[PDB]
C-alpha cells in the first residue's frame, strides 16, 4: 500500500494553469498576511 497508493486530488488547477491564474494565485498568497 505504501508503494502503490497515491493521495487523491481535485481538478481545480484547470484555471490556475493560465498565466493570469498564476498572477491571481501569486497576489492572493503574497497578500495572505
Amino acid at each position: 500500500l505504501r508503494l502503490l497508493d497515491s493521495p487523491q486530488s481535485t481538478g481545480s488547477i484547470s484555471q490556475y494553469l493560465t498565466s493570469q491564474g498564476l498572477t491571481q494565485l501569486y497576489n492572493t498568497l503574497m497578500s495572505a498576511d
Binding site: 505504501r2 508503494l3 497508493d5 497515491s6 493521495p7 487523491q8 486530488s9 481535485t10 481545480s12 488547477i13 490556475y16 494553469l17 498564476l22 494565485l25 498568497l29
Partner: protein, 1029 residues
C-alpha cells in the same frame, strides 16, 4: 618480539582480541602505515598450531610413504607465518586477509554483546585520524567496510557509510551496505529504511548513475505527479517534465492534496534543473538573485553579462563561494584572471598559477572517483579539455597583445592554426547539452574578445559556425523550439558581415519553413522568402522541405512541382532526389498498380544511390524490382539508368539478392552481382558457395570469381573443404541427437496432452521411432531402452518418457566422458599448417556482415591455434576453434555440423536486427546509455555447415539449472515429475473436472516453494561474483 609480547599478553579467545582491537587500541601513528596488519596479527594469535589443515618395489612404497608423512603435519604456522611476513610488502594481501578473517571473528560474538561491538565500531570509524589515509588505495576504511558488509547482522548508520564510501574510494562497498538495509525491513523500520534510501540516492547521484537514481525515486515516491515528471525527465524530453512539476507545485501550494516537504524539495530542485537544461537562463537570473545560489555565476556571467565589464560583483560572488573549492569555481576564477589579462591588468604568470591549482584540484577529484571509467568521469574529461583549451586561449591572448599594427597577416597564420585546431575538437553528439552549451558560450567569449581586439576581411565567422553547430546538436536532441529559436536569433549577429547576415536570414527562413506558418503560406514563403541568395543548395533544400510539407497533405501536384524545382536548382544534391523518390514510392503504394510511377521512382533512387546510410534506398530498389512488371519496364529503367551504383553498399544485401536471382529479376541482379564479385571477392565467395536455369548463373559468377583472384578462390575453397571433411560427428553424437529428439517429442506429447496423462498410451509412431532408434544406434543403454520401448506396442507415455530420459542421461554421460580439450594437428593436419601455406591474406569470416563502410581496416587471419576444444551443447557436441587475428586478438569460433534446415530465416532475422542496431547506435538518447542488440555473427560455410561467433563463458540458463541441481543433488527432471504427478492426481474420476489454470498455478506455486527456490540466479551470481563492484 613485540608482536609476541603483545599477543601472549592478551587473552587467547578471538572475540576478546577483536574487542581489544576495535575498542582499546588508539593507533597512535594515525594510520600512516595500515594498522590492519597489526590487527590481523593480533587476530591470528588466536589460531591453533596442531595442523587441522585440510580441504573442504616395497622400498619405493616406503620412501613415498615417508615423503607423504613429511607432507602431513603441516602446522598453521607454516601457512600463517609466511602470510604474516609477506603482508608487510603489499597492502592488497592485508585487505584480502582482513576481508577473509573479519566475518569469522565477528561470528564468535554472542548476541548479548552485539550492541556494544556496533557502538565500538562506530566510534572507531568516527575518529578523525583517518583523514590522512585518503590517498592509499587499499586503505583501512575500504577493508573495514568490506568486512562489515561480508558479515550479516551488522547495521552501520546510513550517512556515516555514505561519507566513508564517498571520501575514501569505497563507493561500491557503501552501495552494498546501503542496499542490504534498504529492502527487506519491517514496517516499524520505515525511518531507518528511508534514511538508507536517502544515503543510497546521494551515492547514486554522486556516481552519475542516474538511471538507478531515477528508478529508486520512482519506486519510493508516492505522488503520481512526481512519478510522471521523473519518468518524462529520464526519457529525455524536458518541457513536459517542466509542465508536470509546475502542476505538482501548484497543486501542493493550493492545498488540493496533503503538502509534504519531502519530494517538495525535489520538485523545486528538479524544476530548477529542467529550467537550466532548457536554456531558460534569463528567467533563472532573477530567481538566483532573489534567493541566493551558486548558479548565479553559472547563468549571469558564463552565459549572460560580460566578464570584462561589471567585474566587481562577479569577483565578490566567486570569493564568497570559493569556500570548499571545486573545479567549476576554479574555471570561473581562471576565466576572470584571463579576461583581466586581456585588459593587461593581470599578468600571464597569475593565470598559469591559477590553472595549475585548478589542475591539481581536478586530479584530486578524479582520484576520489573509482578506478573503472563510469559516466561520472565525463564531466572531469570535459574539465580537462576546458583547462587545456584555456591555456591555448592564454597563448592566443599573449600573441594578440602585439597586434603588429596593420601587419595582421603576421599573426593571422597562428590565429588560423589555433582556430582550426579548435574547430576539430568538439564533444560528441550524445553528450549532455549542458556541456555543449558551456563550451559554445565559452568560445563565444573568446571569439568576442578576438573581435574586440581586431575591431581581405578579418572578422568573427566562427561565431555563426559554433551557433549553427549548437543548433544542429539541439535538433539531434529533439529539444523544443525555444533553444533552436534562441540559437537562430543569435545567428543573425549584430554588425555581422553581409554574407553571414544573409546566411543567418536564410537559416531563419528555413526554420520558419519547418514551422507551420511558412508551410501554410505556401512555397512563396517556405522556400522563396528571400532565402535564395548565392546559395543554390539552401534554396534546393528549402524547396524540398516545401515539397515534403505539401506531400504531407493531399497536394500531390504542388509537391511534384516543388520537387522538380528543387531538383532543377541543383541536380547534384542527393537529399532532394531521395525525398522525390520516397514521395513517388508513397504514390505507388497509395495508388493501385494501374499507374507505373515505379519507372521514375527506381530511376531517382538509383541516381540518389551515390552518397553512407544508403541502405534504405537499396532495400527499396530491391523491393520495387521484386514486384509486378508484365513488360519489365522497371527492368529497362534499371538497366537504362546510367548512374553509378555503389558496389560496396550492396554487400549487406547479398542473401536477398541471391534469392531473388532465381526469380524474374535475374537479368537485373546479375550485373550488380558480377560487379560486387570482382571488387570484393571474399564477401561473395562464402554465400555463393553456400547457395550451390537458376543455378547456371551461380556457376557463371563462380567462374568469374575464379578467373579473377585465383589464389583467393583456391585458398578459400581449400579451407572450406578441409573444415567440412575433417570435422564430423561420431555415431555416439548421432545417437545422442536421436535420443534428445525422441525425449523432446515424448515430453511434448505428455505435457501438452489435454488428458490428465494418467499413463496415456502413445500412437504407433512412437513405437516405430523407438524401433528405428534401437536398430540405428549402437548397442548401449540407449539402444536397450529403445528396444524395450519398441517391445511394447502401445506403452504408457510415462514409461516411454522415463526410458527416453534414461537413454538421454546415459548418452550424455558417455559424451561427457571424453575430455573436452584436444589438439588441432592430430584431427586436421592442414588447418594447423594453413598459415605457412596460405598464398594471400584472408579476413576473418563474418567481418563483412557488420555495418562498416570501408574494407581498409578489416582484421586478417594470422594462424589457427593448435588447441581444438570439444564442447557439449544443447543440440549436441560441437567443435570450437580459435582463430588468431593480425592485430593479435583471439576470435573464438564454433562449428556446427548438424546446423538446421531453417538457418536462412535465422540469418535474415539477424540481418534485420543488425540494421536496427546500426540505426539504434547513432541516436542521442539510445547511445547515451550504450544500448546494443548484441546479435551473434554467423556465416554459412556450406549448405550443411555454419559457424557462429561463440566466445567462452556463455553458460545458458539451462546450464545454471544443471549446476544448481548438481550442487543440491536433486534430479534434473524433478519439477516435471512433480507437475505430471500433481496433474494426474488432481483429475480424480470420482468427481467432475477442476479448473486447469487454477491447478497449474497451484502446482507452479508448490514448485517455486519447495523444488526450485525463487532466489536461484541471485545466489548463483552472489557466489560467482565476490567483489561487489
Amino acid at each position: 618480539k613485540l608482536m609476541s609480547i603483545l599477543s601472549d599478553s592478551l587473552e587467547l579467545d578471538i572475540d576478546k582480541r577483536l574487542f581489544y582491537i576495535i575498542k582499546d587500541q588508539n593507533w597512535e601513528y594515525l594510520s600512516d602505515y595500515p594498522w590492519l596488519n597489526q590487527a590481523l596479527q593480533l587476530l591470528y594469535g588466536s589460531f591453533h598450531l596442531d595442523s587441522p589443515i585440510r580441504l573442504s618395489i616395497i622400498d619405493f612404497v616406503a620412501k613415498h610413504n615417508e615423503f607423504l608423512d613429511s607432507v602431513r603435519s603441516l602446522t598453521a604456522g607454516d601457512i600463517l607465518n609466511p602470510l604474516i611476513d609477506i603482508s608487510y610488502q603489499s597492502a592488497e594481501t592485508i585487505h584480502n586477509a582482513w576481508v577473509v578473517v573479519f566475518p569469522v571473528a565477528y561470528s564468535a560474538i554472542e548476541s548479548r554483546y552485539e550492541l556494544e561491538f556496533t557502538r565500538a565500531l562506530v566510534k572507531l570509524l568516527f575518529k578523525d585520524y583517518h583523514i590522512r589515509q585518503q590517498d592509499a588505495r587499499p586503505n583501512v576504511i575500504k577493508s573495514l567496510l568490506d568486512g562489515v558488509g561480508k558479515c550479516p547482522g551488522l547495521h552501520l548508520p546510513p550517512h556515516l557509510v555514505k561519507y566513508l564510501g564517498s571520501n575514501y574510494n569505497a563507493w561500491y562497498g557503501a552501495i552494498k551496505l546501503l542496499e542490504e538495509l534498504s529492502e527487506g525491513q519491517g514496517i516499524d523500520n520505515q525511518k531507518i529504511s528511508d534514511a538508507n534510501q536517502d544515503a543510497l540516492l546521494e551515492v547514486y547521484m554522486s556516481l552519475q548513475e542516474d538511471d538507478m537514481f531515477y528508478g529508486t525515486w520512482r519506486r519510493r515516491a508516492k505522488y503520481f505527479e512526481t512519478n510522471a515528471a521523473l519518468s518524462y525527465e529520464q526519457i529525455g524530453i524536458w518541457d513536459k517534465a517542466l509542465q508536470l512539476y509546475e502542476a505538482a507545485q501548484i497543486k501542493a501550494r493550493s492545498g488540493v492534496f496533503p503538502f509534504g516537504e519531502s519530494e517538495y524539495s525535489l520538485w523545486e530542485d528538479h524544476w530548477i534543473y529542467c529550467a537550466e537544461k532548457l536554456q531558460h537562463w534569463e528567467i533563472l537570473t532573477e530567481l538566483a538573485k532573489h534567493e541566493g545560489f551558486t548558479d548565479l555565476l553559472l547563468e549571469c556571467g558564463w552565459r549572460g553579462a560580460d566578464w570584462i565589464a561589471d567585474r566587481e560583483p562577479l569577483e565578490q560572488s566567486v570569493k564568497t563561494v570559493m569556500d570548499i573549492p571545486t573545479p567549476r569555481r576554479q574555471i570561473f576564477q581562471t576565466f576572470l584572471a584571463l579576461q583581466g589579462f586581456s585588459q593587461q591588468k593581470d599578468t600571464l604568470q597569475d593565470v598559469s598559477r591559477l590553472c595549475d591549482e585548478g589542475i591539481q584540484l581536478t586530479l584530486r577529484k578524479w582520484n576520489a572517483l573509482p578506478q573503472r571509467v563510469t559516466r561520472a568521469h565525463i564531466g572531469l574529461l570535459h574539465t580537462f579539455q576546458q583547462y587545456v583549451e584555456l591555456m591555448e586561449a592564454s597563448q592566443v591572448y599573449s600573441s594578440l597583445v602585439t597586434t603588429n599594427a596593420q601587419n595582421l597577416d603576421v599573426k593571422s597564420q597562428e590565429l588560423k592554426r589555433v582556430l582550426q585546431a579548435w574547430r576539430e575538437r568538439l564533444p560528441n553528439v550524445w553528450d549532455d547539452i549542458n556541456i555543449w552549451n558551456d563550451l559554445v558560450t565559452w568560445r563565444q567569449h573568446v571569439f568576442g574578445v578576438i573581435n574586440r581586439v581586431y575591431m581581405a576581411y578579418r572578422g568573427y565567422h566562427e561565431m555563426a559556425w559554433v551557433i549553427n553547430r549548437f543548433a544542429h546538436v539541439a535538433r539531434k536532441h529533439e529539444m523544443p523550439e525555444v533553444c533552436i529559436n534562441q540559437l537562430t536569433k543569435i545567428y543573425t549577429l549584430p554588425n555581422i558581415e553581409i554574407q553571414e547576415a544573409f546566411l543567418k536570414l536564410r537559416e531563419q527562413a528555413k526554420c520558419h519553413y519547418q514551422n507551420s506558418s511558412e508551410l501554410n503560406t505556401g512555397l512563396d514563403v517556405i522556400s522563396n522568402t528571400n532565402l535564395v541568395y548565392f546559395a543554390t543548395q539552401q534554396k534546393a533544400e528549402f524547396f524540398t522541405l516545401k515539397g515534403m510539407f505539401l506531400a504531407k497533405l493531399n497536394a500531390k501536384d504542388e509537391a511534384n512541382q516543388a520537387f522538380a524545382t528543387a531538383v532543377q536548382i541543383d541536380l547534384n544534391l542527393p537529399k532532394a532526389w531521395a525525398e522525390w523518390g520516397f514521395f513517388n514510392d508513397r504514390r505507388f503504394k497509395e495508388n493501385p498498380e494501374e499507374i507505373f510511377h515505379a519507372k521514375n521512382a527506381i530511376s531517382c533512387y538509383l541516381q540518389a544511390a551515390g552518397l553512407g546510410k544508403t541502405r534504405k534506398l537499396l532495400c527499396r530498389i530491391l523491393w520495387l524490382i521484386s514486384l509486378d512488371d508484365a513488360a519489365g519496364s522497371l527492368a529497362k529503367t534499371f538497366e537504362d539508368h546510367h548512374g553509378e551504383s555503389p558496389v560496396w553498399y550492396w554487400i549487406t544485401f547479398v542473401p536477398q539478392l541471391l534469392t531473388s536471382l532465381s526469380h524474374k529479376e535475374a537479368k537485373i541482379v546479375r550485373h550488380i552481382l558480377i560487379q560486387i564479385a570482382k571488387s570484393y571477392p571474399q564477401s561473395l565467395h562464402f554465400q555463393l558457395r553456400t547457395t550451390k536455369q537458376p543455378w547456371q548463373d551461380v556457376e557463371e559468377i563462380m567462374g568469374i570469381l575464379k578467373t579473377a583472384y585465383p589464389l583467393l578462390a583456391l585458398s578459400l575453397e581449400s579451407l572450406v573443404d578441409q573444415l567440412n571433411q575433417r570435422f564430423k560427428c561420431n555415431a555416439d553424437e548421432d545417437a545422442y541427437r536421436l535420443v534428445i529428439v525422441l525425449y523432446n517429442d515424448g515430453v511434448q506429447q505428455m505435457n501438452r496432452v489435454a488428458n490428465p496423462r494418467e499413463e496415456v498410451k502413445l500412437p504407433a509412431a512412437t513405437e516405430a521411432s523407438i524401433s528405428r532408434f534401437a536398430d540405428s544406434v549402437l548397442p548401449k543403454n540407449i539402444r536397450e531402452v529403445f528396444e524395450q520401448d519398441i517391445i511394447a506396442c502401445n506403452p504408457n507415455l510415462e514409461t516411454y518418457i522415463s526410458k527416453l530420459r534414461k537413454w538421454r542421461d546415459c548418452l550424455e554421460e558417455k559424451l561427457d566422458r571424453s575430455y573436452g580439450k584436444a589438439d588441432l594437428e592430430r584431427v586436421s593436419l592442414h588447418l594447423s599448417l594453413f598459415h605457412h601455406q596460405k598464398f594471400e591474406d584472408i579476413e576473418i569470416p563474418g567481418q563483412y556482415l557488420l555495418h562498416k563502410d570501408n574494407n581498409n581496416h578489416f582484421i586478417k587471419i594470422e594462424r589457427f591455434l593448435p588447441t581444438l576444444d570439444l564442447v557439449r551443447g544443447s543440440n549436441g557436441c560441437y567443435k570450437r576453434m580459435t582463430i588468431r587475428g593480425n592485430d593479435g586478438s583471439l576470435h573464438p569460433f564454433a562449428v556446427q555440423f548438424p546446423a538446421a534446415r531453417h538457418c536462412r530465416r535465422e540469418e535474415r532475422i539477424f540481418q534485420l536486427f543488425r540494421i536496427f542496431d546500426d540505426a539504434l547506435s547513432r541516436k542521442v538518447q539510445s547511445r547515451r546509455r550504450n544500448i546494443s542488440l548484441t546479435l551473434p555473427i554467423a556465416v554459412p560455410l556450406s549448405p550443411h555447415i555454419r559457424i557462429l561467433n561463440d566466445d567462452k563463458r556463455y553458460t545458458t540458463l539451462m546450464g545454471i539449472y544443471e549446476e544448481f541441481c548438481r550442487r543440491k543433488g536433486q534430479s534434473r527432471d524433478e519439477p516435471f515429475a512433480y507437475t505430471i504427478q500433481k496433474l494426474r492426481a488432481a483429475f480424480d474420476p470420482r468427481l467432475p473436472k477442476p479448473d486447469i489454470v487454477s491447478v497449474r498455478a497451484e502446482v507452479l506455486a508448490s514448485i517455486q516453494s519447495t523444488l526450485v527456490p525463487s532466489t536461484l540466479l541471485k545466489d548463483y551470481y552472489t557466489e560467482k561474483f565476490s567483489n561487489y563492484e
